[PDB]
Structure formats: C-alpha cells, structure tokens
C-alpha cells in the first residue's frame, strides 16, 4: 500500500466538516473527561490523523482508514446509547467508508469496521 | 471494566472449537506466509489472546472482544474474497458476539466490529 496524502487529507477534511459537534477535531484531555484514559486505550482524533498524514507516519491509505475507524469505535464505546456524542459516532460509522470511497480511497467492504 | 477470566477463556475456547480450518489457533509465521507482516500491522491469534487473558494483559471483557475482532479483521483483509479462509472469517465476524453472549459476556453491539 501507498500513502496518497492528498486523497487522505480530502477524507479527513470531509469528516472534519461533517463533525457538527466538533467532537473529533482535537484530542480528549483529562481536563475535558477525567475517566476517558481509563476507558479508551488508543485515543485518536482528526487533527492527529491530519498530522500523521502530513508527516508520512501512516504507511498506507488503509492505515488512515483504520485510524478513522478507531476514532469512531472509541466514541461508540465511551458514550452511552442515545447521547448526541454516541449518535454522531453511529452516523460516522454509517458514512465514513462512503466518504473514503468518495475521496478515491480503496475500501475492503468485507474487512472494514 | 473488570476482566472476567473464566468467561473470556470460555469465549476463546468456543471460538477455538468452531475454527474448522484452524486458521486462528496460532500466530502466522513469516516462514509460511512471508508477506503477512507487510499486510497486517496488528497480528493476534486465539493462543496469544488466551495467554493475554491468563496473564491479566487485557484490562476488560471489552478488550478481549476487540482482540478477537482484530484477529477476524486481519483474516478478512489478508485472505482474498472467494477463499475458504476469507469465508470462515466472514462467518466468525457474524457470530463472535453471539458466542460471547453464549459465554455470559456483555457486548456493545453499536461499538463492536
Ligand atoms: C456525557 C459526556 O460525553 C461527552 O462529552 N463525550 C464526548 C465529548 C466530546 C467533545 C469534545 C469537544 C467538543 C467541542 C464537544 N462539543 S459539545 C460539548 O458541544 O458536545 C464534544 N468528544 N468526545 C469524544 C471524541 N468521545 N466522547 C466525547
């Protein structure tokens, strides 16, 4: 796999604009949610993903997609059913692979979160 | 957030016995599949997960379910659609939470792979 930085930044950018709560824009601090570190082993956010793309940290487009999946899974695990954070996370899970496709990324439909 | 070792081990054992191809029993070695580590960043197998439960490496029942999910995702990514290995992994993705429930574990259906 190759890292297509333009295609990967387009994908993050589309997700950033669809994030109406701005809940995925920045890393979660203990200051914000004191118990978050206790629940979530692999925190990740769209600013951190953009930096990972721009720096070449991700080896492939697939790794960027897996980072977005992880970010969405985190919010579904942490947040109770019915809260706006849980509901936007569910919406993201529903659309993120379509957004990836719409940016020209290859999606493994059977394997994808 | 408590690791329920008996129920997690029971869960791993049920998956072991349902693994007819034995494709999840042991770590994949480069000596058999030299490209495996190139494709798959997060290798995990039922023997490794059993050891992680036994040692208390996993912090929670959720972490054990996520390790099993990653094992299944690995097989769906690595094995081409149409192969018996890809097809068993499709089956496992569709039943692993059902098996977890049969072993008395709680599942997060919205979050789960
Ligand atoms: C019961 C409390 O639950 C939570 O507040 N959960 C979460 C909240 C945020 C979050 C961050 C930053 C902002 C600006 C906001 N926007 S707001 C306060 O208007 O909704 C939200 N992110 N987040 C992520 C990721 N995962 N869970 C959460």
- What is the quaternary state of this protein? homodimer
- Write down the overall geometry of chain A: globular
The CATH topology assignment of chain A is Histone Acetyltransferase, Chain A
Helix content of chain A: 55-70%
Number of helices of chain A: 5
The assigned structural class of chain A equals mainly alpha
Instruction: Please write the string of helix (H) and strand (E) elements of chain A.
Output: HHHHH
**Which ions, cofactors or small ligands are bound in this entry?**
Bromosporine
- Largest interface summary: A-B, 18 and 15 residues
| Head-to-tail CA distance between termini of chain A | 19 Å
Backbone CA Rg of chain A: 14 Å
CATH superfamily of chain A: Bromodomain-like
Proportion in β-strands of chain A: under 5%
CATH architecture identity of chain A: Up-down Bundle
Query: Got a strand count of chain A?
Result: 0
Total of domains of chain A: 1
Major β-sheet profile of chain A:
none
Name the CATH class of chain A: Mainly Alpha
Domain Bromo (chains A, B): 16-86
Protein name (chains A, B): Bromodomain factor 2 protein
Keywords (chains A, B): Bromodomain
